[PDB]
């Protein structure tokens, strides 16, 4: 008996930390775009 | 002068919001790719597990059958 | 022996390509909202 | 005239940002639904696999037991 | 025979409903920031 | 007066867009955490399933072997 091999089944990981960091950076930098007449 | 200030601040804010929208689009695309890959992986695992437990069921059935033949 | 059936276990897929395309379309169209005094 | 231009451009930008926020909300909702469905699917698979390997362990134990009875 | 125990393998769930609700709330409230000269 | 109105509306809109960007960042972070946890979970399940079907294959091989010795 030779059972099927499943060792190849793999699940990727996501690395969107750059984009989350950029979103928070822009949410912080938008205070430099406020208008002070 | 105040109009030029409003225009400059608005252009800066629109540039930053464009950067934020591009970052959100990239993040959503990466999350879509990864979630879809893991979905295909779980589906492949489910399929091949179905096949593998089918084989195990067949071999255990043959074992129990000849087994029964023994005694 | 009758092992449990798992063939029904299924994982959905996500199709947010419309929304990503709309986000990029808006990020491109926001240049038409810039102010040119 | 310049004030009307600033106001029109700002209203256009706010409309486009509203569209972008609605698109981001829809995308996050769809991703949440799919990730939660795949989580429930993996949990159901883990549970039923636990049950199935339990059954396999029991039947292999019975096999090994009577087996041992044979010789 | 003692097969490996997998009962601990668990998959978390995500609850970003607060954030989706906030996004829709802001997309609705941005009509209160439109300029009416 | 109209300049103060434009400035106030723009500051309000930038505040709301900052709130929206913080919400999107939080949502993307939570989705990343959950997708990565489910990825690690599927990988752990695949590994331990590989080991478990390896054990099952070995024990079925031993069974079939002595089995064959029987008749």
Numbering used by the authors:
A (entry chain E), C (entry chain F), E (entry chain D): 1164 to 1200
B (entry chain C), D (entry chain A), F (entry chain B): 918 to 988
Excerpt from the publication:
We determined single-particle cryo-EM structures of the five selected single mutants and the Omicron triple mutant of HR1HR2 using the same molecular scaffold (NpDps4) and data processing workflow as for the EM structure of the wild-type HR1HR2 bundle. In marked contrast, the A942S mutation leads to one additional hydrogen bond between HR1 residue S942 and HR2 residue N1187, along with an approximately threefold increase of fusion activity. In contrast, the fusion activity of the A924S mutation increases approximately threefold.
We therefore designed a scaffold to efficiently determine structures of the postfusion HR1HR2 bundle and its mutants to near-atomic resolution by single-particle cryo-EM.
